[PDB]
Symmetry: C3
Subunit: 618 residues, 3 copies
Amino acid sequence: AVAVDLGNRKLEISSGKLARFADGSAVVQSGDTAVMVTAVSKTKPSPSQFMPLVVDYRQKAAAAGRIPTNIGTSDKEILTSRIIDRSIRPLFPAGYFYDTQVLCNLLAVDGVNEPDVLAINGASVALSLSDIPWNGPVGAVRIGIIDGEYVVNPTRKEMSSSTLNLVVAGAPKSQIVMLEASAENILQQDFCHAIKVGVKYTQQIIQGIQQLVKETGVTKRTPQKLFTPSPEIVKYTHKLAMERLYAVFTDYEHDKVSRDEAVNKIRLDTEEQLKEKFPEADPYEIIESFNVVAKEVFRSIVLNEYKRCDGRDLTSLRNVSCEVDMFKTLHGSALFQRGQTQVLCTVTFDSLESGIKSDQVITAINGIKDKNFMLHYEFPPYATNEIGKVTGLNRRELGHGALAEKALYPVIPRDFPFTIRVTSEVLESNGSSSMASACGGSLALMDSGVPISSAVAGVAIGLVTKTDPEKGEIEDYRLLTDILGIEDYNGDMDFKIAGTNKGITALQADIKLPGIPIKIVMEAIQQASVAKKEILQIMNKTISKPRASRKENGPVVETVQVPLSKRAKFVGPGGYNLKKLQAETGVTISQVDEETFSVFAPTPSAMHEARDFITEIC
Amino acid sequence: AVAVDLGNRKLEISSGKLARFADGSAVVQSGDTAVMVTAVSKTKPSPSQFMPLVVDYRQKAAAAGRIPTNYLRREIGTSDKEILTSRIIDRSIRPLFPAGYFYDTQVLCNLLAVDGVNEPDVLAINGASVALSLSDIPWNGPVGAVRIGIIDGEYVVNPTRKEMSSSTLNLVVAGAPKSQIVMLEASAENILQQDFCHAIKVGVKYTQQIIQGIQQLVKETGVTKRTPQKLFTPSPEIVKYTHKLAMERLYAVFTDYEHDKVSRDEAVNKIRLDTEEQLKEKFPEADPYEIIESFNVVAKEVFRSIVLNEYKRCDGRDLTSLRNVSCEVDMFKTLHGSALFQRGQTQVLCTVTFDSLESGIKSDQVITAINGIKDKNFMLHYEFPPYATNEIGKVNRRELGHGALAEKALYPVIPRDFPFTIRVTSEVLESNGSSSMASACGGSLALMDSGVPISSAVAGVAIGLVTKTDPEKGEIEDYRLLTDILGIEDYNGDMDFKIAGTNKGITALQADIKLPGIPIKIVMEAIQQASVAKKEILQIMNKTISKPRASRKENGPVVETVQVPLSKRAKFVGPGGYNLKKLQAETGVTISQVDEETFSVFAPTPSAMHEARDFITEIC
Amino acid sequence: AVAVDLGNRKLEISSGKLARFADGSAVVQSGDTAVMVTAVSKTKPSPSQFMPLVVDYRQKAAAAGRIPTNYLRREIGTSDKEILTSRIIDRSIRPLFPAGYFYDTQVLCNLLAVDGVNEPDVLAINGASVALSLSDIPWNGPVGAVRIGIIDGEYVVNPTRKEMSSSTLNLVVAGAPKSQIVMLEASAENILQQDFCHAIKVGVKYTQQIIQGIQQLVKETGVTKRTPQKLFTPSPEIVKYTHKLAMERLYAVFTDYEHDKVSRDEAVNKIRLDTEEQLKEKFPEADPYEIIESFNVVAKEVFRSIVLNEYKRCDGRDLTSLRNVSCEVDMFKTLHGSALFQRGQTQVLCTVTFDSLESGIKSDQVITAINGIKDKNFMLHYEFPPYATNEIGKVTGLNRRELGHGALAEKALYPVIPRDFPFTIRVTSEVLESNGSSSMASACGGSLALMDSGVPISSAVAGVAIGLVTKTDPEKGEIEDYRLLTDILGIEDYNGDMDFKIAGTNKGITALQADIKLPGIPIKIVMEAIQQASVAKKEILQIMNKTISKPRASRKENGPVVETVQVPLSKRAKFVGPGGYNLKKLQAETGVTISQVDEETFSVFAPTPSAMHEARDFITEIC
RNA sequence: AAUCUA
Ligand SMILES: [Mg+2]
Ligand SMILES: [Mg+2]
């Protein structure tokens, strides 16, 4: 057991008592909250030609106050699993194509110490003490700002009064592997200092975990094969396809489909030559060698020539155009276009009672939104000309919706008369769809008449690094503004950051490298601030201020007087008449007093239909 | 952009603005309702040896687009109304795909906006036609879809929501070029056959106007169709070789009138397992699947040649004769109503269960709204267990579609203001075709056996079709309409024309046309032919039972209200209704408070009422 | 159309009327309750290398067939009672299928009618037997199934619903011809062993009469069995050659008492890899599965021969010795109650949480809550995470295994749970380590956690599993010798003949589930399996009593607290908000449950006293 | 999916 001190917090880490059959197990305890994290990795190679890592963070009695539920994973559990997955996936060795599952069990929760941060550290310790190949321990802390003071691992009470909710995962040598933040439109300088404080605290956790690894003997397994392309067949692919790929990536009038088809034309014209040259080569190895050669050729152009595949410099945006009031019956609407990415954002007002539901146990599972504000994000298969199932929601769609929701959350007004639901549908996808959902969402919010404090613009910052194979240190790098899909795919990170013209509201740094220096992170934040200014200026031309009032076809809430003698007929047997009227019409009726009822009509026409029934009944 | 005028209604078609990445995309707008339909088809052939076409119609709100909470909940992802609309769109566009187009195709419908006036389901069908027409996906001529209603004796094209609630007909017609009919799906309030037939002719006329507008939009756009990598149809030289190997043996099998479903299928499979192995030797390089489909083509042609040339079915009937129909009722004492309907080798078990009126409404508004209350307090659950075909399967879109059709058939004769919620359960114990239509006949018997005072008995039948078509002109030379088709005649036929009604009208219709459209003359004669069969079936059913029972069974449910004083309300109801909720789960009764002093109690059985009564008395 | 008389009950059995397309069909009727059971078996062999038998018992209504649920089946899914009934039917008919029958088989039960008096679950087992007997599916002799209850000290066959609610024993017996018990499943209210044993003897006598009636129906129908395309059993000459290679190596592994679960399995797999290559070159044309199953047969025979010949288990103990048992309580402060039970290499984490009495009522009370309400407000939730076996698996929802094991452990602890407890008792048993008996360890750990939580259970409950290794005549098929094993490991359950799980207090039996893999076993073997487990259970209760012998005098300080706060009538509208909006908002944001109990009284339930502070401030500020 | 906690 090792105790790590973090200011006024203490992190108790232990292993060797529970779940000893697993490849790796660890118990991380803070206060009275204990999380057991387990890592299991299969020994046989996976049929899939990639890393089949899955993280399942499960909560027992998932509610505020620990109400024991006792079928579906909660959205909070899904988001926590994605944060853990992003913290540990970069540190896995390349070619580790083995099925791996990390499971988090909430042994105890005291309602004071948040178990989500403990689960990330537990995943690090379980992997560190296991035989699973994994490069270096990571440390995860949460940084908040309470009354201008930075606090490490704030309690539940402190988090409720914090202007920042930032989670930092750090690697050895003060590297950063994961950033996930949501701020109440705080200054960039305050945001930058919180990352500096967080990275310092993760180093203390890392050296504590390293002490635990030193005490208990850890022998790493030897995988039967690491599925990385052979260097001698990678460099032969370079000879065949470098010139053709170079012309394609300097062909500045390509679009998304044309560039992809041109690359695939070279791939089909080179993969067959690779097969004859190396008959014994793995069929997947042939595929990955072309991906390796294409990726490095793509990045070499950016590093050497400071020019991108579509002919713009490292700091300029794509073509941005937007419009509002697309359709008459929508309460609010906006079509935001950025390059070849198109998002349709719709604002629908709802009754405040639609935020709560029946099944109060289920209601506490997903909670109640503080501002009665939610964002539903959809990524239809036709956005990328693909076939896919539309039932349910993906993990990626849930995560993208949460990021866009917390980007717009700081500017959403308090105590709005209606529940605000924003539906962002990605009609066309070429990268930064979630950030486009924030810009289009704010445009649609202003079009619907919601008096938001400021317009919110999001942007994605890419990164291309030259890393020496001798030590793994970064010597040169380029930061790209408003990256395309191919730049995210061939890049090192997807630094999605949103905010108003005077602050930052959300951040999600999806770093594919085993860690980046804090210097790069600071420069990416500054670079994104300038790009955010340009996007906001374009957005303000379409609409700069919220409309003076909501659309005339919007919802209306009015009270109806029902006498105590006639109320039996009004509600019927067990509320049958009220529920029947709420099904044939969208009107929601909720009793307020013994002689009055509150009627919410989604449209003025629905109000007329309901009013006819109320008079006829009474 | 092209505008099509359909009487007093206007249709707006546009493309090139939204979802430019999809193979095809279109926005269809009527009034303030706009629907975007996209069509994506893969380039590589699908591993499955058939057409993998899936239509997903999605709604962003419920109750005429007035429930914004609907698509917040990914749970309860799809409703029955969405499934039925997806099946309608699928039936309208599936027959127009080229034969052998084994490519994964998905058609997705997004409701951009709905005004609560114009119905988006018909616009979705037209949007699917435009998206496919403008795309590079190989697809035949444009399909126009309209809805025809009868309001105050007048035929209305694309009636609004208000007009639909007052119309005696809800008919959806999909038309191909040259006034062909691709899909028919109607629910009628027991209207006359002549009135029904006129609406089909009116609808076909209106669909041609839509096809004209879509054709102009296609002309303006530079639409170029892709060349598929391979169309998976058997080679003509292989089909012709299979013909001389198995035509005589298949002919003897289909002229043997002593075969049942299993014996005929086994005899056909015996020839298949004898000819396919010989096909491999003659064509070593042939695609293995091509061999399976070659025998299917030969068997289908031999099967149809007998009906056309000899006017005789495979079981010895003529074109108009029905199968043996036997009925039974009151088999089980505890069931409120029951009926066992047998038609040939098709056996359907129908059960009527009476429930409380409040049982039809869920505990939350959102789920209640998305799956709205039924027009009457009546629903039909349709089950197709795997053992009905001696198969193994998990315990469905097809069962939902069949149940909706059987519910549509029986809905017009269901009485109004019935004290209980009528729930009809149809279980296909044995399947040999027209199981859904047998569910309508058996359901009528079970409703009469349970004591439900239906206005008239309802019988349904399926009409087959066997055509000889010109290989060059594509025109129908001669055709045979078949009465009460078997399963094999559906499989080898051109359409499955399910139509139900009383002795004096038509209540439901669903034409599953597998041809690229059929002439309106064939449809009119199929309706007339089904009228003759419907009368004969109703005559047999009347022998088993001709009128509803004078009263419900003595074991049936009963409602009665008990008095609870205000002082005893706290003890009786309990903490937050806990005591009431415990009772309604133990004894099976349902207690609903109707006023301050009295509670209404519904008990499924008189014994269940006895159990709840004794427990209630000791508390009070 | 054959009627079987069982005392004052009748079993009407018929066929040839409904669902004639199925390979087998039968209608079994008792009183006014009728059940149709169908059996469909494919003719083409399954691509899998085992037996794909699935039983789906489906109901069309809940609460004795009062509230219909078939229409909502798409949304409500399969109820817990249906899953448990399917497992009982599966256990009754699975052992009688011939070895090597690798063909997809589905047995479907359709409840034609229920009168609320005769339970259809027993008729479904008999209907499965008749449907298989009259079908062409290769199946062994008919199986009769009865339920035995003890009402007022007398034994009742197939008790009604009214009688079952007054019975101290809910025992279901499935019997084979010649009085061979094939399935046992029971839940007793801490009854004596002598009374329990007599009920089994009575039940087997009644199942013989049903078998006689089914045999009469089969004879008059004229049933002809199909000939399977192939029975996938290893060739006798292939097995013999495998026994010439792996016999000595496997014998050394199983006589090496220093092994644990992982090392022993790794040692066996090392021999498996060595032998399979020699088998492949010796029999190149052999089925690749046949090579695999040949080693399994040889390894099973070597493993069992040591127990029979030498009376010693693979870990060195004797037939009656228990593995090491360690117990802990109060491992976490915030848990209302917790325990850590270890038995060899089987570790179970048991947690007790108290909720309000209204947490046992679902959302759709009229229809969803009808799927089940706990009698004593007590339930056990059993989880088997994939890392207990060091495996990877899907981890949302419960499979049939976890529902069955949780039901068994819940029934073991149910008799000792007190009555009129102020809170809803919820026990969660998570298997952290698995080496053969986790469901029984959930009963022991659950008893410890209940005492640690402060619940005054009548007595401690201990569960044990009894294995069985038999020597069977190749020609006659009669058992000539047998050994009963106490506290079996996973390897002994896998290579054994039965998984006899029984639990109870020091004075009686509370639960039983006999997972017999043989096609029936003599009643005397079952008789002394109960007796042997009585000795084993006594020793386990001695170890558990050392850790904790009596429940704690009071519940933990951080436990739930419930009391009522008065809300004035003039401001009740503000307190509840629009349509109870404020109450639901407070419940989601704090966790407290507020339920109106009078015209001015609201009962507040708080999971923790700290959360009650938050709620009390909220009520104070919102008046 | 279903056996299978080897
Ligand atoms: Mg077992
Ligand atoms: Mg077992």
